[PDB]
Amino acid sequence: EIGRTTDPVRMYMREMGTVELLTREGEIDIAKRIEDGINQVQCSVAEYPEAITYLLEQYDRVEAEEARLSDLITGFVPELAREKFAELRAQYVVTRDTIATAQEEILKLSEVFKQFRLVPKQFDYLVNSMRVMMDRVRTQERLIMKLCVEQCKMPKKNFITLFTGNETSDTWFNAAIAMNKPWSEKLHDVSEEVHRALQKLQQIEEETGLTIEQVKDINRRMSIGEAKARRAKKEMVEANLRLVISIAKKYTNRGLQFLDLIQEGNIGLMKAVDKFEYRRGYKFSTYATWWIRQAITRSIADQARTIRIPVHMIETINKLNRISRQMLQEMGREPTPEELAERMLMPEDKIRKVLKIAKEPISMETPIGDDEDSHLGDFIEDTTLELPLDSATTESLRAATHDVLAGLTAREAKVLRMRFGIDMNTDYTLEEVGKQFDVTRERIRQIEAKALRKLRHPSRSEVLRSFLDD
């Protein structure tokens, strides 16, 4: 039963039905697990001082007329906020000035930070800064192990014993070389790179202000918390796929595919899971339905037409259609667009424009009866082409104007050709022409006027006069 089908709907239904829906107790348990993981991640990220440093820097930037208070803290768990930030700054400075009390004061600072409701973007910035620093530390560590374990070929267990804990000194530097083995004394050339890696680690440690093992502990603790939260969210999504499908059932004939609708519903369900709260006592379905229907409707308004229409205009069109239907049902027959202005609040032209908005375009390959098996696309002609009669008239006019310009004097022909875009890429202004010819602008104008008068004189340009078709 693994195959014998082609439609992906059946396979999706099978994969979805392989799992079973939850109950209220399971929802409460999953919410509790999510809260526990979030609290663990919050503690792990508050236990670091660089979070407080970034908080103080952002607060200083806000106070320096460079940002706003809206994206600083998402409420509280505004003079009170200012005094709390001042207290946090004082706690941080006394923590930096109390380098055996540093650990306890860091714990107190972390508790006060957790007492503050920051912004998710700020929390993500703290998380990615932690990731950057731990990635630098682990890159240095892998360079350290590659420089002697994979280069000096020094023993595994010996490396583990003399490297677990120190990670800073020459315990892995001189021992791997001066241990009287035939393959040990051959990499004083890479000893320099070993020293450079040690200096890089020392600089990173000085910048961080803490050890390395505690950093690794925080990193893997928050990784475990994130994995637990992801597992719980995946369980919730797999449980509520059925509700997503049930909600998406009712929009299957609005220009969008059922699979697209259910995918948008899944996205909305994930968004709702990301913000669900179980302390209110309400069931998850009531909170998820709003998000799912909002996502489905937004997708329908966005990507269900060949020509995109804004959400507000789509809502206006829907409201107009609903009114019109209600008035038709109540009164008896189709009303007039002028009468809709009395019922609604419109200047009587917006309704006309909405009605004049073009519907979905007609298919090019639609047939018209038999018509010797011909479609609509066989009766559309290109309007951008120029007639051969027009091209021949243009060629004749060019020849005639060239012949007429040959008769005039050389200077007159040159100044004419310069004034008008004739036989050249572009025309030249009267001032540039005068400058090129070393002749004043007014004299150029007078010579042009004399030429025009001579051309207006009769017994010439008879074909030019004949070039008018009126």
Binding site: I2, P8, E238, Q263, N266, I307, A358, S363, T366, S396
Partner: protein, 1337 residues
């Protein structure tokens, strides 16, 4: 600018290099001012500007800023025509397989990866896992695991095990595959293993992989990563008149694809669950598959409302595709159409043309003439004058149309004569006049038919139309060498009335000094039109060497014939106008005058004949009246006798003496006899009904009836029509197919009743349906025949060959249906002819046999002349003129360059709508036998013991007049060379049971049979004869199956009887159901009976099957090689056919069915290609066993017989050309020294030239066997993929081409038409030769 086209598959890098940008949004327009949106399907910055040299933002709107890109929007300032050739690309987020290479008829990817298509589709559907690089995990490189199995394997091992799913896994496997290692492994397997199916599969795999390696393609490129975007203009979004829009389905498909890709990217960014990611990947795969080819993989996606969407493959394919609807045929300018009329005053080389149509057509010519004459200063002034229609534009038109031909064409173009050229004559009206003589050629009438008009434009086209397509230049049919402009109805009637003597008339027996005074006496009213008079005439004869000799004498003729003698050209005898001059006589006279004088006298004589016939028909004024249908006075009596006989037969049936079937047969026979009697009586009464008396008692002559003359001049009507008009119309046919026992006894002159009318309606509707379907079938057949032989062009003059085809007259066992003159005229002789008596040398070898040579051969009574043919031509890529012979449309020989294949196909396909025991000698002759093993029996009759004996009747001229097949063991009265008389029985036999007589005498004894085991004891109830019926294998038991009844003739000494001339015993193993005539203990004699063993579609589906090479349903078994037969042991079957040669081995064996009768005996020696069974013969076996001559002779004979039965005359040159084209491919047996495979199928010309080169060098050639293919198979198997893709299976042809990386040289007619240049057939042959000679100089 180019000479070849290369096709392959596109790499992602090349696709990116094609693209001018990336498309990221599906937005089309902004619904306000309809401006092109950014990064959309119609993005201006990607696909170029919208207007000419106009920026999108307006900053630059002049040609001065051409070539510079804007900074506000980025839109280059250039022409708007670059929007028609600019393409975009889309960066897919996940790999997507190509639907063509996956769902093509052969699964390219499946058989490349040695994986089943079902399994590959399973992996693609995200159903099961697949292992890649298993390593030391005890897992195969292509093993498929389910979800549970994959989880179990991951639990045990977390490393050294890689498993993926879908297009990514397929691409990884394709990349990891090693082509060279696969090739060497498959070659080693081919060398080691020995199996037919395995060898075939490995050979196909090795060929495909070697071609892939030779080509520059890569296996991983079959999975799409970046896909191209069609240019905007090819999928327009133009605003329709009324504020609406029109769009193509490609826009919606691209929109879908883009939206699903964006959703997949968003879900990947948001770390979506695995199930959702898989669902999105599946949606993307489905969207791409539906964009590429909708409806191929699953159900087709519906469009806007109801209809399904159209894809790129849909546009490429179909009858309405680009290849057929917009590239092979195209609408053209300078064309016009209207209704046609007669206009009898016209000449053969001119037609009538309305003034308005010619004024509308020759507008540029009029404009140029007006400009040149100085009447109009400007082209606009000339156009205004033409619109105003002044008095000078008509003169200008008369000047320009004086010598400018035109083209007239009818909408069905069945043959070459569907388009002709004429010389326009300006007339008043809106209807075209067409010459009556070309009406038969055009197959047009005057009941609302229409025709098209085409104006040649260039000088070369005008000269071609004048020199080749002119009506006077083609008077002979290309199909047969006969005239095609012969009069049909009115002229034939007029000439028949003119030349028809009478018994008594005015001025009988007057002596006339000339046709001039004969016409005087006619016009003056002093003599009748047709009276027997004496006229002095002078005739001229070309007996001299090109000179004419005049002789004068007195002849007995009529006034009409004397008057008609004026228009006869001065090259013909007077005897050709001294008859009734029907339609056949008129055609023969026209042909004789042509062949004797030339061309100009022929057309002049035809015009004069038509004028005279029209005039004299109008002068006679024959009519039709109700009294013309003469009812015989015996019809009622015959009807009464028939009714009495029917009543008597009914009473006899009621008495129980006869059965229902016999009663029906008797009734229908009586009715048919009555109908024949009535028809004969009415013929006799109508044919000589006119009786008069001249200067005496009485005399009888041919009847003067109007209908009789109409039916006897061949103009209209026939014997069937006359029978239906003046007599009963006979028996009808029920819808089931049988014949109603009650005929229609009323004719059309009397009143038919409702029952008979309702009965006739069935036949009328059947006829109408058959006519409706025949055209639809003939069109397809003609297209299939044209597309297979379109590349055949005469290219050489003499190939220097010595082979030929033996040509003999067709004899069916009676009167000859095809004289030897018809099958030999116009052909070149392959070998020098000898004298009939074999005494002197006759006409030389390389002569062209014209009418003089044919007359000489007839006079000398030559039996059979052999001639060359195109199937034996040695010319490579074409044929020579000598082998073809002569074009049977002009007097001279065939010219070089003519595309004979198109003419042959058209001639074959044109008449397709016309298609729906005792020997009794006829005439005295000498009995002749060929290949007869005869012997004298005990009764004196010449019994025959050979199955290949033909009875022939040779007269004293030495010509063959009869041909009969003599069954084996038939009684013959006469012998060889014995003179006989007509109507004498010479041969007798029993068709219901063939004899098992022996050629030797002696004793018959019973050995190796047991009563009940093999034979049964039965006593006849009536005759009482005691005979032993031999039971077959199924009737007998299993024990006696190995003991066949063996009867052997023994002499009086007990030894086996030796056949005279040999010593092999003659024992016969009787098969089942063999009744033995004589028992043991009774001496027999040679030629005595010993044992007895009991023993066509209409229309042209026979022609279709013959041209398609379809195998018969029950083919006749033939002998592979000559030798003795050694029956095989039943092996779950009837018998095993093993033929032992004289000295060679006998490994051959055949599976003979038990329900098929066999003819060969136990000790009968068979010959190569000899028949073993009875039934239809297979053309492939015929070819394989008797060369190409036998099979081409069989095909030609069959098609000629069908066409002759249908009444259509077609020359066999076309058939021969089609057979040659069908006999183009050939396979390889074994390669001597040139690289070739053991089963590869290549062109015959290639291996021929390779073998010639090897023989010229010091190497050894190879061996091949000719192959026979159908027309469609030959057309599909073509070196050029363009022609194959144009015909059928476009997707398959393109896939194979792409995969193989084939290079296409034009080298043809259809490819040059597709590309749009001169074809190398007509005037462009010399241009093509010059181009070839310039290239590679």
């Amino acid at each position: 600018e180019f000479d070849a086209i290369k096709i392959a598959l596109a790499s992602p890098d090349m696709i990116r290099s094609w693209s001018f940008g990336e498309v990221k949004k599906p937005e089309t327009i902004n619904y306000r001012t309809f401006k092109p949106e950014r990064d959309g399907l119609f993005c201006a910055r990607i696909f170029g500007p919208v207007k000419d040299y106009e920026c999108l933002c307006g900053k630059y709107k002049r040609l001065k800023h051409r070539g510079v890109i804007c900074e506000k929007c980025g839109v280059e300032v250039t022409q708007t025509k670059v929007r028609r050739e600019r393409m975009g690309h889309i960066e897919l987020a996940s790999p997507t397989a190509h639907i063509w290479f996956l769902k093509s008829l052969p699964s390219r990817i499946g058989l490349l990866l040695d994986m089943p298509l079902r399994d590959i589709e399973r992996v693609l559907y995200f159903e099961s896992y697949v292992v890649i690089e298993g390593g030391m995990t005890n897992l195969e490189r292509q093993q498929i695991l389910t979800e549970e199995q994959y989880l179990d394997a991951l639990e045990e091992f977390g490393d050294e095990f890689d498993a993926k799913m879908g297009a990514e896994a397929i691409q990884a496997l394709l990349k990891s595959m090693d082509l060279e290692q696969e090739c060497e492994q498959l070659r080693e397997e081919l060398n080691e293993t020995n199996s037919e199916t395995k060898r075939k599969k490995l050979t196909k795999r090795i060929k495909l992989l070697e071609a892939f390696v030779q080509s520059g393609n890569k296996p991983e490129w079959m999975i799409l990563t970046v896909l191209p975007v069609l240019p905007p203009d090819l999928r327009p979004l133009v605003p329709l008149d009324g504020g609406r829009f029109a769009t193509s389905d490609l826009n919606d498909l691209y929109r879908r694809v883009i939206n699903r890709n964006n959703r997949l990217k968003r879900l990947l960014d948001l770390a979506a669950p695995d199930i959702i990611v898989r669902n999105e990947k599946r949606m993307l795969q489905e969207a791409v598959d539906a964009l590429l080819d909708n409806g191929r993989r699953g159900r087709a996606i519906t469009g806007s409302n109801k209809r399904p969407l159209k894809s790129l493959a849909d546009m490429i394919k179909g009858k309405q595709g680009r290849f057929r609807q917009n590239l092979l045929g195209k609408r053209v300018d300078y064309s016009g159409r209207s209704v046609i009329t007669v206009g009898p005053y016209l000449r053969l080389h001119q037609c009538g043309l309305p003034k308005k149509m010619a004024l509308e057509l020759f507008k540029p010519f009029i404009y140029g003439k007006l400009e040149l004459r100085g009447l109009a200063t400007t082209i606009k002034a000339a156009k205004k004058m033409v619109e105003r229609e002044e008095a000078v534009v008509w003169d200008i038109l008369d000047e320009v149309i004086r010598e400018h031909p035109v083209l007239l064409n009818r909408a069905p173009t069945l043959h070459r004569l569907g388009i002709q050229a004429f010389e326009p004559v300006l007339i008043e009206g809106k209807a075209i006049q067409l010459h009556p003589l070309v009406c038969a050629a055009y197959n047009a009438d005057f009941d609302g038919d229409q025709m098209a008009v085409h104006v040649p434009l260039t000088l070369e086209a005008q000269l071609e139309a004048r020199a080749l397509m002119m009506s006077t230049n083609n008077i002979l049919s290309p199909a047969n060498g006969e005239p095609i402009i012969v009069p049909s109805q009115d002229v034939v009637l007029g000439l028949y009335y003119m030349t028809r003597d009478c018994v008594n008339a005015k001025g009988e027996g007057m002596v006339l000094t000339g046709p001039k005074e004969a016409e005087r006496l006619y016009r003056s009213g002093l003599a009748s039109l047709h009276a027997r008079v004496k006229v002095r005439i002078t005739e001229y004869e070309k007996d001299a060497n090109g000179e004419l000799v005049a002789k004068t004498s007195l002849k007995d003729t009529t006034v009409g014939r004397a008057i008609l003698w004026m228009i006869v050209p001065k090259g013909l005898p007077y005897s050709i106008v001294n008859q009734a001059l029907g339609k056949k006589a008129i055609s023969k006279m026209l042909n004789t005058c042509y062949r004797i004088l030339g061309l100009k006298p022929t057309v002049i004589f035809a015009d004069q004949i038509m004028y005279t016939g029209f005039a004299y028909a109008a002068r006679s004024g024959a009519s039709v009246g109700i009294d013309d249908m003469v009812i015989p006075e015996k019809k009622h009596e015959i009807i009464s006798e028939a009714e009495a006989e029917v009543a008597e037969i009914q009473e006899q049936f009621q008495s129980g003496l006869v059965t229902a079937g016999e009663r029906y047969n008797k009734v229908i026979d009586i009715w048919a006899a009555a109908n024949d009697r009535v028809s004969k009586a009415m013929m006799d009464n109508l044919q000589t009904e006119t009786v008069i008396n001249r200067d005496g008692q009485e005399e009888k002559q041919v009847s003067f009836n109007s209908i009789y003359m109409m039916a006897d001049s061949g103009a209209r009507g026939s014997a069937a029509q006359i029978r239906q008009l003046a007599g009963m119309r006979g028996l009808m046919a029920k819808p089931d197919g049988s014949i109603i026992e009650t005929p229609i006894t009323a004719n059309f002159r009397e009143g038919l009743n409702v029952l008979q009318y309702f009965i006739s309606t069935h036949g009328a509707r059947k006829g109408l349906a058959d006519t409706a379907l025949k055209t639809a079938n003939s069109g397809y057949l003609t297209r299939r025949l044209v597309d297979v032989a379109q590349d055949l062009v005469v290219t050489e003059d003499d190939c220097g060959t010595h082979e030929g085809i033996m040509m003999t007259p067709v004899i069916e066992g009676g009167d000859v249906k095809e004289p030897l003159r018809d099958r030999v005229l116009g052909r070149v002789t392959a070998e020098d002819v000898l004298k009939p008596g074999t005494a002197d040398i006759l006409v030389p070898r390389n002569t062209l046999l014209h009418e003089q040579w044919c007359d000489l051969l007839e006079e000398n009574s030559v039996d059979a002349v052999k001639v060359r043919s195109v199937v034996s031509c040695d010319t490579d890529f074409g044929v020579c003129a000598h082998c073809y012979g002569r074009d049977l449309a002009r007097g001279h020989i065939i010219n070089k360059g003519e595309a004979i294949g198109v003419i042959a196909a058209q001639s074959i396909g044109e008449p397709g709508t016309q298609l729906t025991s005792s020997i009794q000698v006829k005439n005295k002759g000498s009995i002749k036998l060929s290949n007869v093993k005869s012997v004298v029996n005990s009764s004196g009759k010449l019994v025959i013991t050979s199955r290949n004996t033909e009875l022939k009747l040779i007269d004293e001229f030495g010509r063959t007049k009869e041909s009969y097949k003599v069954p084996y063991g038939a009684v013959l009265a006469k012998g060889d060379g014995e003179q006989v008389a007509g109507g004498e029985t010479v041969a007798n036999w029993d068709p219901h049971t063939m004899p098992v007589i022996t050629e030797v005498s002696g004793f018959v004894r019973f050995t190796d049979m047991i009563d009940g085991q093999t034979i049964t004891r039965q006593t006849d109830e009536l005759t009482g004869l005691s005979s032993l019926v031999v039971l077959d294998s199924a009737e007998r038991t299993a024990g006696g199956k190995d003991l066949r009844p063996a009867l052997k003739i023994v002499d009086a000494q007990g030894n086996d009887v030796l056949i005279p001339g040999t010593d092999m015993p003659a024992q016969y193993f009787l098969p089942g159901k063999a009744i033995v005539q004589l028992e043991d203990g009774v001496q027999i004699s040679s030629g005595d009976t010993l044992a007895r063993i009991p023993q066509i579609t209409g229309g042209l589906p026979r022609v279709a099957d013959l041209f398609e090479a379809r195998r018969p349903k029950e083919p006749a078994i033939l002998a592979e090689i000559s030798g003795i037969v050694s029956f095989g042991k039943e092996t779950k079957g009837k018998r095993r056919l093993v033929i032992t040669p004289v000295d060679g081995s006998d490994p051959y064996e055949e599976m003979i069915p038990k329900w098929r009768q066999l003819n060969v005996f136990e000790g009968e020696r068979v010959e190569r290609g000899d028949v073993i069974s009875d039934g239809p013969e297979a053309p492939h076996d015929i070819l394989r066993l008797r060369g190409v001559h036998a099979v081409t002779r069989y095909i030609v004979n069959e098609v000629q017989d069908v066409y002759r039965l249908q009444g259509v005359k077609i020359n066999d040159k076309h058939i021969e050309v089609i057979v040659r084209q069908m006999l183009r491919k050939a396979t390889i047996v074994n390669a001597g020294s040139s690289d070739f495979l053991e089963g590869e199928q290549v062109e015959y010309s290639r291996v021929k030239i390779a073998n010639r080169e090897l023989e010229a060098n010091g190497k050894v050639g190879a061996t091949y066997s000719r192959d026979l293919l159908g027309i469609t198979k030959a057309s599909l198997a073509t070196e050029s993929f363009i022609s194959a893709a144009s015909f059928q299976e476009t997707t398959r042809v393109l896939t194979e081409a792409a995969v193989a990386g084939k290079r296409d040289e034009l080298r043809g007619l259809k490819e040059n038409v597709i590309v749009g240049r001169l074809i190398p057939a007509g005037t462009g042959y010399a241009y093509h030769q010059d181009r070839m000679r310039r290239r590679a100089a």
